[PDB]
Design a protein around this nucleic acid. Structure first.
Ligand code: GTP
Ligand code: ZN
Ligand code: ZN
Ligand code: ZN
Ligand code: ZN
Lengths: 55, 50, 46, 49, 65, 1097
RNA sequence: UGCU
């Protein structure tokens, strides 16, 4: 729900490469910004399977 | 096989023998067009073997 | 709803439902394209 | 100078990506090194016992 | 791909003369006298018609059909 | 009395290209690898058996590769085309089969056909489906006839194996050491081991160093150990010159200082000095016989040849210790080019050895303790091992051969489909063994040895300048021969056996050594007769035309090279100031009576190697032929490569200009092939109205680039206009751009996969979510069809889904979550086609072909086929564009200020030639070192009525008054590049950040921000904008508020210090997230930073 | 891998 008006019309609309869950009634920004990884960072995370990580 | 945009550009490059003095400029918008300031040309060609 | 497709070599209109092995009759080619839409599209001559 | 306890950092330094496309995840090298250290400690304890 | 309708520099209608130029080529007319008979005085249209490559048939040979 | 010149001489190049040239090299190499080398490897590894349970064996009889097939059908093979492979993202390989015979229970059982793997088949190969096909069949199979081919197709991507350039093996190299000690080295490489042994004079005496010895030992001890114990004989072998003896004296003294005088003592010393892997004596003898100098064979522990070899090496070292005659590594006469054939042969041999070892291990583990049921190999014959090995080696590009200890990277690269010229130029590239190890500048410099072999001007501009090269228009790479008849002829021509005479004869001035592939073949006298007879026999044909023979007088050594990988070039034989080829022969060739093979057989044209032309004399033209000439140059313009062949009149421009022109032609925009519409790639650029150049070169006519041009000819006027063409920029015409000039099409591919997981569940495409309010699909699912897949013909906007894919989360009712393929794009795109294929894994692959028709605008880059790259500065209307008396307005206006500093007279010559051609209805030639002269085009202009200098009377369009100076108008072939301002434009808002460090991402595709590097930080510091630097590097990048405890100085959380279990001394503080991460990493490393806070006052 |  919206913290200002209490409406449940929360839509995820990316505004110029900016992911943002904003209400569709009053435009109140609920949440903004997402943490992704970066390529060198992706490169350096190594792939480990569940067969080994789970136990 | 010709692209839609290339075909539209080639068709736009084709001149029309209509007299421009008898027509007027289309106002801002109004994509439907009016009888005074629009001309319609249909092109329907279906190629088939002889 | 009858979903229609076109073969890569026979170019024949084939009707297949969902979750079917992609194939075409009177041949064995496994390339199936989708026909062009019927909706009205507006283009600009610019 | 002689260490008897290793300081495992928080997860902010060890980012983990949940790759749902396969049965595995992308983990950094520090996590694997700490896992190997714990395994070696357990093996040493088993041999001592 | 296909002969353009308008010329880049001036803009004279040249797409309608492509088949005529091909006919002149099939005939005994050379490039120079063919372009001269087609009515192209300025060299822009001559270049447009001479430097053009006909690939529409090469693409239709691959078209679905 | 001028020497007569054969005008049709250039007709020898098309005939040569009919059977060789640009792409035939890799095709022939792959054909040989799959026809002879694979059979030889199978014969070498024909028998494999296990130690346990004797009388059991697995014998291979004959291996086949068969035709390319696809394993899609249910245990059924079906011919598959390369285009179908590209579309379905599979590999274009053929099933490798073999017939074998084994013993299950002592009863011999044979198999006539058993698959063991799959070998990726190269296109246009012997077994490929494209070879021996007409253009009609190519069209039926959806393949371009002009496609060069010769590349592999694996998983849908086109990979090309570049030609590796390394140093020649089994050759002595005398060079300076690190500190500067002139020593020698030799890398003996046989079919099994490769060992590099060196010899240094660090302390006036010759110490030999090998990787298997603890410490370098004197050479006299090795002499005494190899059988020759007489110091007199050793000195006679080293040399009889006064300076030679004076330089070798110290070695004899150091040897006499010790008590080593017999072979037994020398071998004992060597054994004591040998590293761990009389027993020591046996190991020393074994290392001296096999390990050291593997290329020098010993009949039966007879080290005479090896002694003579080391003596010749020491003699060369002594001779080099005086006059600084140091050999250079960049001399391509000692280089070898390994094509894809040798690489694939080595890889297949390694994989077959691994498979044999695995089979032997499985047998040893199964047969002795399984059961009375007799075990056979068929039940464990892995058929996917070789397939996966080849697939990975071709895709990843990293080759790791443990049997040879070879770890190479970047062997395979993605074939650049930017244009036909780009592909044809990338197919003929050459990578070096250095691979950007040091900025030596030596191998990067252009050596005179590249004459006629590699293109001097074609080189990528950047960090890889000098290391990546392209072959010339006319060249060939030799293969390996049997070397039997060569040795036979050498022995019959009077070559004395080296074992018959002592080494004293090696010091004579008239006695010349003769070497065969690094091995001492013997000695000879009057080497002129030997060389003449060998060349005459090779021309007659009894010796392979590719066997090279060179003579070096400084060392008195005649080398006979017969190994593969050597670069050769055809040359016309000249005898007594008259070439052998005549007008009659050229007329016969033109009419079809003879061919290039007939010319080779009739002793008219012959292949020369680098080392052979080093001694032979060549003539450029007929008028240059003098009394001392042995060969004649076929054509000078062949010196340039494929990419450089497009340059019209290149000998009138500068070298950097040609380099930039080739670099930009490798990216030029244009048509790819006749199947470019059915081709679906991740990124393709096409031109609307491509036109062939007016000034086309003979190289263009040969490569058939006129059929697939990559540019348009526009009426360019060289002048300054509006000052929007200050620095290399150009002004375009609005009306020209509106009439279709420069129109480009960008085709992108969006692929989606619907695969089945382990559980009996599959990803499904949901229908369009219709809005109950309007009973129509929502704006996001508006372009979707009834099946949830976007239909062709419509336009796609930003943040719109193409495939409403939903995948299960379990891998009781399945729970599907949506993961649609959204379209990220600033501009709209139109869907041309939607292909749906099904793989063998029941996976549905959906590929939608997005198209974007873009118009030339401000910021687009353009080239003029002369390296005069520019950017669109302004687009002025036609009424603003000037006009001449005829009324022609220029489409492009370039800056004349770029001509003085760049000396691009070739551009002016091309413009004048194109003007004359468009006026007279002809096509002038800009062939290098020739072509149409300026006088002919001036005559054409003055005949047609235009100025004989290109400059014409032009009137200003703005003011309407004539200009005081004439403008230089003419048709120039401008080509548009892939660099688009629409794609290079970027603007980053807050956007996302990285998980590890809370900072913007790197790439634009991932919505990355710019980087204020160390240089930017230094500039800001120099300016002194402290608040600006702070707002940039702290506030707007990684701003964060942490909690620090004023008691212990550690980092807290939520205003609480877990260390002291208190919250009275905890306070907030602004700090970069990167600095906080650094503090955390240091605390983990046990370097605890204790922060002592204080008031800001 | 390309670009400046
Ligand atoms: N398009 C592109 N291709 C690359 C890039 N980097 C590497 N490649 C491919 O990899 C080869 C050389 O890259 P390298 O510099 O060896 O890769 P690297 O040494 O790891 O470079 P770093 O990642 O900076 O260390 C080239 O010949 C390419 O085959 C790149 O940054 N962009
Ligand atoms: Zn709200
Ligand atoms: Zn069909
Ligand atoms: Zn014109
Ligand atoms: Zn504290």
């Amino acid at each position: 729900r919206c913290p200002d008006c209490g409406s449940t019309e929360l839509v995820e609309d990316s505004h110029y490469s900016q992911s943002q869950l904003v209400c569709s009634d009053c435009g109140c920004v609920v949440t903004e910004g997402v943490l992704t990884t970066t390529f060198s960072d992706e490169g350096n995370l190594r792939e480990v399977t569940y067969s080994r990580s789970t136990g | 096989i010709v692209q839609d945009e290339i075909l539209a550009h080639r068709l736009g490059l084709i001149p029309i023998h209509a007299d421009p003095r008898l027509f007027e400029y289309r106002n801002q918008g109004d994509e439907e067009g009016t009888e005074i300031d629009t001309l319609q040309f249909r092109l329907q060609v279906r190629c088939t073997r002889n | 709803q009858p979903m229609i497709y076109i073969c890569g070599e026979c170019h024949t209109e084939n009707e297949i439902k969902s979750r079917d092995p992609i194939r075409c009759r009177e041949c064995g080619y496994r390339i199936m394209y989708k026909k062009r839409t019927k909706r009205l599209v507006v283009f600009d001559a610019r | 100078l002689i260490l008897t306890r290793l300081l495992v950092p928080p997860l902010c330094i060890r980012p983990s990506v949940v790759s749902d496309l396969k049965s595995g995840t992308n983990e950094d090298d520090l996590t694997m090194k700490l896992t190997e250290i714990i395994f070696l400690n357990d093996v040493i304890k088993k041999h001592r016992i | 791909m296909i002969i353009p309708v308008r010329c880049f520099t001036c803009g004279k209608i040249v797409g309608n003369k492509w088949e005529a130029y091909l006919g002149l080529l099939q005939a005994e007319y050379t490039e120079g006298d063919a372009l001269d008979a087609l009515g192209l005085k300025r060299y822009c249209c001559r270049r447009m018609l001479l430097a053009h490559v006909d690939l529409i048939e090469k693409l239709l040979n691959y078209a679905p059909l | 009395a001028p020497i007569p010149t054969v005008e049709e001489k250039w007709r020898l190049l098309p005939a040569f290209l009919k059977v060789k040239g640009l792409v035939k090299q890799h095709i022939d190499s792959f054909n040989y690898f799959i026809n002879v080398e694979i059979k030889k490897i199978m014969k070498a590894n024909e028998k494999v058996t296990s130690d346990a349970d004797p009388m059991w064996y697995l014998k291979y009889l004959n291996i086949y590769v068969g035709l390319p097939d696809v394993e899609e059908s249910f245990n059924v093979t079906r011919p598959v085309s390369p285009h179908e492979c590209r579309l379905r993202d599979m590999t274009y390989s053929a099933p490798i089969t073999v017939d074998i015979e084994y013993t299950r229970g002592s009863q011999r059982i044979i198999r006539n056909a058993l698959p063991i793997g799959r070998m990726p088949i190269m296109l246009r190969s012997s077994n490929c489906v494209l070879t021996g096909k007409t253009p009609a069949e190519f069209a039926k199979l959806n393949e371009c006839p002009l496609d060069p081919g010769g590349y592999f197709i694996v998983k849908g991507v086109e990979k090309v194996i570049l030609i590796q350039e390394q140093l020649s093996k089994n050759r002595i190299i005398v060079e300076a050491d690190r500190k500067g000690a002139v020593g020698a080295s030799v890398t003996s490489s046989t079919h099994e081991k490769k060992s590099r042994t060196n010899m240094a004079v660090k302390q006036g005496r010759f110490y030999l160093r090998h990787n298997t010895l603890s410490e370098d030992i004197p050479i006299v001890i090795i002499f005494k150990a190899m059988g020759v114990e007489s110091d007199q004989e050793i000195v006679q072998m080293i040399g009889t010159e006064e300076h030679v003896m004076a330089a070798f004296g110290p070695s004899l003294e150091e040897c006499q200082k010790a008590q080593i005088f017999t072979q037994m003592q020398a071998l004992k010393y060597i054994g004591n000095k040998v590293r761990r892997q009389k027993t020591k004596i046996e190991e020393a003898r074994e290392l001296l016989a096999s390990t050291i100098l593997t290329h020098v064979p010993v009949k039966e522990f007879n080290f005479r040849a090896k002694c003579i070899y080391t003596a010749v090496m020491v003699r060369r070292v002594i001779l080099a210790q005086g006059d600084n005659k140091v050999d250079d590594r960049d001399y391509y006469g000692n280089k070898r080019l390994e094509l894809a054939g040798q690489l694939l042969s080595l890889l297949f041999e390694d994989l077959f050895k691994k498979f044999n070892s695995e089979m032997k291990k499985i047998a040893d583990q199964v047969i002795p303790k399984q059961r009375a049921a007799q075990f056979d190999v068929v039940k464990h014959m892995r058929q996917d091992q070789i397939t996966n090995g080849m697939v990975n080696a071709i895709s990843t590009g990293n080759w790791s051969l443990k049997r040879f200890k070879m770890d190479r990277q970047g062997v395979t690269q993605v074939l650049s489909r930017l244009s036909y010229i780009s592909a044809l130029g990338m197919m003929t590239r050459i990578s070096s063994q250095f691979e950007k190890t040091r900025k030596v500048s030596g191998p990067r410099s252009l050596q005179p040895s590249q004459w006629g072999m590699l293109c001097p001007s074609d080189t990528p501009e950047g960090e890889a300048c000098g290391l990546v090269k392209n072959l010339a228009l006319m060249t060939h790479i030799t293969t390996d021969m049997e070397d039997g008849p060569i040795v036979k002829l050498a022995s019959n021509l009077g070559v004395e056996d080296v074992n018959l005479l002592c080494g004293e004869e090696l010091s004579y001035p008239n006695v010349f050594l003769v070497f065969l592939n690094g091995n001492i073949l013997g000695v000879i006298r009057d080497h002129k007769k030997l060389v003449n007879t060998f060349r005459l026999m090779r021309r007659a044909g009894y010796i392979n035309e590719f066997v090279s023979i060179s003579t070096n007088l400084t060392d008195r050594c005649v080398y006979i090279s017969s190994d593969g990988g050597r670069l050769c070039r055809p040359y016309i034989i000249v005898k007594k100031q008259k070439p052998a080829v005549t007008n009659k022969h050229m007329e016969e060739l033109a009419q079809g009576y003879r061919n290039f093979e007939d010319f080779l057989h009739e002793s008219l044209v012959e292949y020369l190697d680098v080392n052979e032309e080093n001694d032979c004399n060549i003539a450029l033209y007929e008028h240059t032929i003098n009394k001392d000439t042995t060969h004649l140059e076929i054509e000078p313009f062949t010196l340039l490569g494929v990419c450089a062949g497009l340059i019209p009149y290149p000998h009138h421009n500068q070298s950097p200009r040609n380099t930039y022109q080739c670099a930009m032609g490798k990216q030029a925009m244009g048509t790819i092939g006749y199947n470019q519409r059915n081709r679906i790639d991740t990124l393709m650029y096409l031109l609307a109205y491509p036109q062939k150049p007016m000034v086309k070169t003979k190289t263009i006519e040969l490569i058939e680039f006129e059929k697939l041009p990559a540019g348009q000819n526009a009426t360019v006027a060289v002048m300054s206009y509006s000052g929007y063409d200050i620095e290399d920029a150009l002004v375009l015409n609005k009306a020209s751009l509106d009439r279709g000039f420069g129109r480009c099409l960008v085709y992108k591919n969006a692929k989606c996969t619907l695969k089945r997981y382990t559980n009996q569940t599959f990803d499904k495409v949901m229908g369009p979510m219709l809005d109950a309010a309007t009973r129509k699909p929502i704006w996001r699912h508006e372009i979707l069809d009834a099946d949830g897949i976007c239909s062709p013909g419509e336009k796609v906007e930003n943040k719109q889904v193409l495939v409403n894919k939903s995948m299960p989360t379990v891998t009781q009712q399945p729970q599907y979550k949506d993961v649609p393929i959204t379209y990220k794009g600033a501009t709209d795109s139109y869907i041309e086609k939607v292909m749906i294929s099904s793989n063998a894994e029941d996976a549905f692959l959906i590929k939608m072909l997005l198209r974007q028709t873009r118009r030339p605008e401000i910021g687009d880059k353009f080239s003029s086929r002369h390296g005069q790259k520019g950017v669109c500065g302004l687009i002025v209307p036609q009424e603003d564009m000037p006009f001449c008396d005829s009324g022609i307005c220029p489409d492009i206006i370039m800056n004349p200020h770029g001509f003085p500093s760049r000396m691009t007279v070739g551009k002016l010559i091309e413009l004048l030639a194109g003007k004359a051609g468009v006026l007279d209805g002809r096509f002038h030639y800009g062939t290098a070192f020739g072509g149409s002269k300026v006088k002919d085009v001036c005559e054409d202009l003055v005949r047609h009525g235009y100025n004989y200098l290109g400059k014409d009377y032009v009137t200003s369009g703005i003011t309407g008054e004539p200009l005081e100076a004439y403008i230089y108008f003419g048709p120039v072939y401008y080509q548009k590049l892939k660099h688009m301002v629409l794609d290079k434009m970027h603007a980053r808002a807050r956007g996302p950040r990285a998980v590890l460090t809370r900072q913007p991402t790197e790439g634009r595709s991932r919505d990355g921000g710019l980087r204020l590097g160390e240089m930017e930080r230094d500039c800001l510091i120099g300016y002194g904008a402290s608040m600006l630097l702070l707002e940039r590097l702290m506030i707007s990048s990684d701003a964060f508020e942490v909690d620090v405890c004023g008691q212990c100085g550690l980092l807290g959380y939520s205003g609480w210090c877990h260390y002291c279990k208190s919250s009275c001394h905890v306070s907030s503080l602004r700090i970069p997230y990167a600095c906080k991460l650094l503090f955390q990493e240091l605390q983990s490393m046990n370097i605890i930073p204790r922060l002592k806070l204080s008031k800001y006052n």
